[PDB]
Amino acid sequence: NTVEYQKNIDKFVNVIQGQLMSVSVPVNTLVVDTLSPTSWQASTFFVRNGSNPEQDPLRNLSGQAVTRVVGGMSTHWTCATPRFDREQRP
Amino acid sequence: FSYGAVQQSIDSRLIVDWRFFGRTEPKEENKLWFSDKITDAYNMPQPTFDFRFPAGRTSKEAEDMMTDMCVMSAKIGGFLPGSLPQFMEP
Amino acid sequence: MDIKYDVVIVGSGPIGCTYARELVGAGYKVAMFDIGEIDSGLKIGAHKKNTVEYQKNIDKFVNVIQGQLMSVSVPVNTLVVDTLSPTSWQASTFFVRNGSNPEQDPLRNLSGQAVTRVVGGMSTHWTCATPRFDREQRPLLVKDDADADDAEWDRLYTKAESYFQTGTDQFKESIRHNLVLNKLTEEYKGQRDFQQIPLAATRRSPTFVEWSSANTVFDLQNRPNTDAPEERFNLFPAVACERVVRNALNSEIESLHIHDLISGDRFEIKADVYVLTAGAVHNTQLLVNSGFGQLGRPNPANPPELLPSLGSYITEQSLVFCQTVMSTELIDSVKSDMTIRGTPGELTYSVTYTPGASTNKHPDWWNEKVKNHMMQHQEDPLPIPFEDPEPQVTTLFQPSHPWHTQIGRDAFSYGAVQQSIDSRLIVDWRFFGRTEPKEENKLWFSDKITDAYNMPQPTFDFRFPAGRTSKEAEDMMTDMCVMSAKIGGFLPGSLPQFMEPGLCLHLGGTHRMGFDEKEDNCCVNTDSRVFGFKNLFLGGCGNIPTAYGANPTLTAMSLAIKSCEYIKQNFTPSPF
Amino acid sequence: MDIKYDVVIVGSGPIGCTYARELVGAGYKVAMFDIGEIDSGLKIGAHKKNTVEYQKNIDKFVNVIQGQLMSVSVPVNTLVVDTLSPTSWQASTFFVRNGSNPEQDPLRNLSGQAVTRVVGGMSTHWTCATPRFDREQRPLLVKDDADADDAEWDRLYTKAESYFQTGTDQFKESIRHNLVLNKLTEEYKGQRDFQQIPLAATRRSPTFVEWSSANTVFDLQNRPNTDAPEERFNLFPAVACERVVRNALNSEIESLHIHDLISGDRFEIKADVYVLTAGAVHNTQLLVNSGFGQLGRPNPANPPELLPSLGSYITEQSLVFCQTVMSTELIDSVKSDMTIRGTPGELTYSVTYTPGASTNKHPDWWNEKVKNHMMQHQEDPLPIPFEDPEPQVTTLFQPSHPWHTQIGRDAFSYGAVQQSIDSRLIVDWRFFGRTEPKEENKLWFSDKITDAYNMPQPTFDFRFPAGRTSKEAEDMMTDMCVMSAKIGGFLPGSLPQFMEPGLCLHLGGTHRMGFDEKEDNCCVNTDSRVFGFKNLFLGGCGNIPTAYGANPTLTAMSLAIKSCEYIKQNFTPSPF
Ligand SMILES: *Cc1cc2c(cc1C)Nc1c([nH]c(=O)[nH]c1=O)N2C[C@H](O)[C@H](O)[C@H](O)COP(=O)(O)OP(=O)(O)OC[C@H]1O[C@@H](n2cnc3c(N)ncnc32)[C@H](O)[C@@H]1O
Ligand SMILES: *Cc1cc2c(cc1C)Nc1c([nH]c(=O)[nH]c1=O)N2C[C@H](O)[C@H](O)[C@H](O)COP(=O)(O)OP(=O)(O)OC[C@H]1O[C@@H](n2cnc3c(N)ncnc32)[C@H](O)[C@@H]1O
Ligand SMILES: *Cc1cc2c(cc1C)Nc1c([nH]c(=O)[nH]c1=O)N2C[C@H](O)[C@H](O)[C@H](O)COP(=O)(O)OP(=O)(O)OC[C@H]1O[C@@H](n2cnc3c(N)ncnc32)[C@H](O)[C@@H]1O
Ligand SMILES: OC[C@H]1O[C@@H](O)[C@H](O)[C@@H](F)[C@H]1O
């Protein structure tokens, strides 16, 4: 709800990404084999960068994220508010 | 909420987004649980998921949803290169 | 090298080899020239995929294809690079660089179009798909008598199929081929019929296919030789053919001007019959360089002396692509007839089936292969054997689905080959649309810019026509999305897309056939003879004047066979 | 194919061809097998870049290279693909997919290591750089007499240079070459020496270089023939050599077990002398498959019976790479001797120079080419002719810069080839470090997992050693950054970087040479003969036991020459 964001709406994605903190990130196993021989080099895929060694990367919700600001996710949401029909509703 | 770099080649007045969302059957095996050892950034038990989309109706509908988006969106225009039909991260 | 031959052939691809097979066999003294060199091994002009190594490492053959596809027309590059060091030499303009063509509008191009300069041409790397066209795709050879026209096409295609060794049986024992064929057949329930893609190939063994090529049509060995002591043929590689010389009256060709690329020498070669099979782009180039059609940017205020339709009414196909990852239901189905007891990797595990049971879903050979895979590789979570051949499935073009389809695995991959998803699960989908011939769609040649062989630079001015061509193209996209979903969901990184215009290399109509030069807006007649010229013939896909979605080479070969018939009726071979 | 030969050679690369040249020439009845096929033109085993088309389209050759580099050891993939459709078959584990090697630690690999299976081996695509090693990089051939050691190495290198047609003046009239060379010579005056990279090649014309290959060494034609009517040689392509059969006493090889890949039949071939030149990986594989060294994951508690150092002490070089865009200052220097008047594109334009002027910064050959380019291409903003050859510049390995260097343009490009910067501005930089031999750096073969030819799967356990190796590698990086800056800034997209371990394909020491099996931890003596075996010889880079930065093939060829001198003295040819 800023004049600047509604004039530059392509920029709002940055707001969203800035306050979506991933819930569970599995241990990273990407191979980097082009480090300099003088650089400190991992022998294992150890727990780095706040990753979750409990998490099976193949049974995750990797996109699940949380927002910690006053107003919660309603500070960035799309504002779509349909009713559920009977088939979807408790 | 755009998902990749915003393209600048095609005039934005021509672009229409399509997002279709499926319903997921509740299954006891699909879980959110909390580590008894690993903690998050606020020293609280670390969230972990054990999730897959259930076989049967949830999976069949998910794929028929994809087909429905390909069929429907074609009535408006062809796909924008770089934003082709895809499942998003769970 | 002689000064004089009965027949000279420009190009050693499969269409020039059709001419050679017919005419060398009929006793003519033939020379063939190709601008490229021998580089398929000891079988001259053979398929480069016919190595044991390439068939064991089939993800590698894309490199061979890419290695010998030289882009026809690359527009001047306008990418902004603004992170050079300030000491580096920097352009003030987007100047003509790196062999780019300043004639080319980047927005009306066939960017994908590319040419191959090697003995055997494109048939050293092609997919070997050889479908016939149905009537709706096919030009007319007999007007006002459709049964005569059908008979003539069936005789010509049958011959052409013999030349290429076309069959429909080479993949009949693949589990993946039958898995996908049978599911599609069931799902369509008579609305569409499926078969094996007709392929120019012979299976040698369960792990090796001898793919056909130019070599299969004609072995390209000089003659006479021990196997053919009464025949006369010479092939001259690394010879650029540049011009055919017209008599004053524009009724005959008097010589062919060539340039030997190794010596630098130039010659005028004399023949009774001149045959141009240099490809749809280079036949056009050679003719324009020889004073046919119009050199330079089209100018309708200066109509050409000869062949006003040369380079107009060009057609290229729309091509849509994706890959899929086989459904869980389909993979479980592979093992539907099996009884599986215990835990894999333990000595109590077993997999069995009942041979010849009436109610088995699969034949005994299938079940045998599944059983042996599952018992010998209990570490593996799939039931498909490791060296199972790829699918090769089609539903051919029909009026209700006016596109050709190839479903399976193609050597011409389009991005990095992914390694995360098992290859056994992957099926490719390529659907090819037909394009209406329109006068405004053009291949022309610059009067100033030249190519790497100092020949007039090719330039395209092309868009897919509005109306039918475009509606069908999008409908074809939708059809691929709908069909492929019956087998599996899309593979991430191979999502449904249109390919670059001309990537599919099915360009037609650049020197098109018809019955009447003016009424049919054409360049050659049904003998592939250039109108007005007694002794000048063209072969290839540039001949085809129709809108077609199927792969064109077989159709071009068939036209070449018919052209040969006319040669044999109108020119006498010299005495041996 | 006969069952019996005087000498059998495994592999038709340049090192097997060195054995063929010496021993066929000396009268032995020789057979050579290769697992790959004749695929390169009528000159068997020749360089694939020696076509007119590749030298006009030199950016396309990287595809040829890629097409025949098959990775040695690919670890199990752990990429997460979590955007499949829910209907698609989805893995529960990172199971063994796509021919991956579950033995391989992805973090202790040579992931860039690759093998070539074609007649002529890797010499069908190599760069042709053939420098000599100085003492510091070179194993001893004479103990306790440095001068005699140097004399022996000079004798052998001189022959090897002759066989490959090594030379240092093929690029001497390249503007780009001399511009870079002169600038680096001045910048490092009295500190480092710069010269042309020694290249196995013969210039044929100003726009064509005949690159050497295996074919240069030995033509690979069957003999006897008209040109060699008393020589005896047969080459058998598409034959996988699987095992040398040891006698029980482990003193002699009794036969070579082969698999004909076309028929599928197996044979046992007898020879007097068995020569293994299958490359540094596949020689090791064939020996371990034959009971030498240790099969399976290394286990020091079960010492092997034979050749305990086989597959240990392996070395591969560190490689750093970048590209630069030529500085404005250097570009403007190219035309420093020209007098320019008039308007480019008009009849008033004139570019001239004074031949011989003492105030000229460049030679007359250089100015003549600049002038002719500027006059014939007056629209073009650079003074460099379009077909000016690339630089080929080096400063060879020295103690104060203990790395090999190659500066110019290599056909093995590593990313998509940029098109926005004019190619005449681009200079490549590749610096190669030496690697200490360490017993813990190993190539070993799985006892369960097999490759595409059903042979034991190679596995690497490799890291660049701490200490001098590592320090010099980083110092090498910094030296590239400092030196390249004298020519121009970095090209975006080709910034200074280490290449994947083993991408450089300079693997050595996998069956290393020394004087004494135990004291020098080695596999072959200085005749290249396998310790303990009368009639088994190894050739190739796997013989080299030292830490070397320079390209190894010339050195391996030198050692094969010496080996043949022993063969000729200790075995007699059979009667013709
Ligand atoms: C991010 C996002 C979310 C939605 C849309 C788009 C995007 C990019 N669009 C959208 C949504 N929902 C719709 O129905 N229609 C749409 O068009 N989005 C989801 C929606 O945004 C959420 O469902 C909604 O806010 C949920 O409301 P809530 O149940 O009030 O939860 P919030 O997460 O908003 O706020 C919770 C709140 O609590 C705080 N917090 C968290 N943990 C603690 C602890 N331990 N102590 C104290 N406070 C805590 C958070 O900081 C947060 O503010
Ligand atoms: C590259 C490609 C091509 C096809 C397939 C797949 C791939 C990646 N798949 C395929 C195709 N066609 C089908 O019907 N089915 C499929 O499954 N491909 C197209 C097919 O490959 C071509 O249509 C066919 O070769 C055309 O045959 P041609 O008319 O004989 O033409 P070529 O381009 O093969 O050979 C021309 C020949 O001429 C030489 N040349 C060119 N210019 C000159 C000059 N001026 N002088 C002398 N010689 C010249 C060339 O070097 C070339 O060898
Ligand atoms: C690929 C490459 C390699 C080099 C350069 C560039 C690139 C991209 N440039 C280069 C190199 N070396 C130099 O010193 N200077 C440079 O400028 N390259 C390395 C060079 O190419 C090799 O060092 C050289 O060929 C090694 O020669 P060789 O020892 O004869 O080994 P090859 O690998 O060439 O040939 C072996 C031959 O054996 C066959 N084979 C393999 N296994 C089997 C079995 N089991 N049975 C039968 N035959 C087998 C292969 O098929 C092969 O042809
Ligand atoms: O882009 C790949 C396609 O190329 C066309 O030329 C072939 O006819 C198709 F079979 C297919 O391989």
Ligand SMILES: OC[C@H]1O[C@@H](O)[C@H](O)[C@@H](F)[C@H]1O
């Ligand atoms: O990666 C490219 C490098 O490959 C090596 O094998 C060559 O010896 C170098 F000349 C260089 O071409």
